[PDB]
Ligand binder design. Structure first.
Ligand SMILES: [Zn+2]
Length: 206
């Protein structure tokens, strides 16, 4: 076994959401990564650009949430507002039966003012573009002292010269031992460096 969703120790309410996406059986990326991410181990995974592997990290991300705590517990970083919305919609659909999971997308698109206000209400999962979330963190609006997991989706684009420093600053505000799941089409030096610096005994997937 190990190629079926119910073989991964997932909440029944979460399984319902998964299947309602049309995901009957786990893809190879979800099969290899879900059990490992669930165990808490850092991951570096090769995957094509797009929302293809969204489920691979959204499922363990959602499974780990404790909806009894109203603090932001997970973060997903993406390079564009477009991907942020696609991933957020999927996340909202998959967690629809979990009983109150709150997702929030915040990027250069949505005006800052409204997002500040929105962060006054409970938010469990923040999906965002580099600059916007760093801004919200520095302003003290996005409290991330409970972030237990952070995902870098398209790490090569997020670690380009224009964002690398912003990513570095983000990581610095999170709890020291936060779980890091990294997904990227390519593994340039910039990704290798960031990985050596912050990931702990990461499980790799080519
Ligand atoms: Zn339903």
């Amino acid at each position: 076994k190990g190629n079926e969703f119910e073989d991964y120790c997932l909440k029944r309410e979460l399984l319902m959401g998964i299947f309602e996406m049309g995901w009957e059986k786990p893809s190879p990326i979800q099969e290899e990564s879900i059990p490992i991410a669930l165990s808490g181990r850092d991951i570096l995974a090769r995957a094509k650009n797009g929302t293809g592997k969204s489920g691979a990290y959204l499922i363990p991300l959602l499974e780990r949430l404790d909806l009894k705590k109203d603090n932001i517990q997970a973060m997903v970083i993406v390079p564009t507002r477009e991907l942020a919305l696609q991933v957020s919609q999927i996340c909202i659909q998959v967690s629809k039966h979990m009983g109150g999971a709150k997702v929030m997308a915040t990027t250069g698109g949505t005006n800052l003012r409204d997002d500040i206000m929105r962060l006054d209400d409970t938010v469990h999962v923040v999906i965002a573009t580099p600059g916007r979330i760093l801004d919200l963190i520095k302003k003290g609006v996005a409290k991330v002292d409970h972030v237990q997991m952070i995902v870098l989706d398209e790490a090569d684009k997020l670690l380009s010269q224009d964002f690398v420093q912003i990513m570095e600053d983000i990581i610095l505000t999170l709890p020291k031992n936060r779980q890091i799941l990294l997904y990227s089409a390519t593994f340039p030096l910039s990704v290798q460096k960031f990985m050596n610096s912050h990931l702990e005994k990461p499980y790799e997937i080519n």
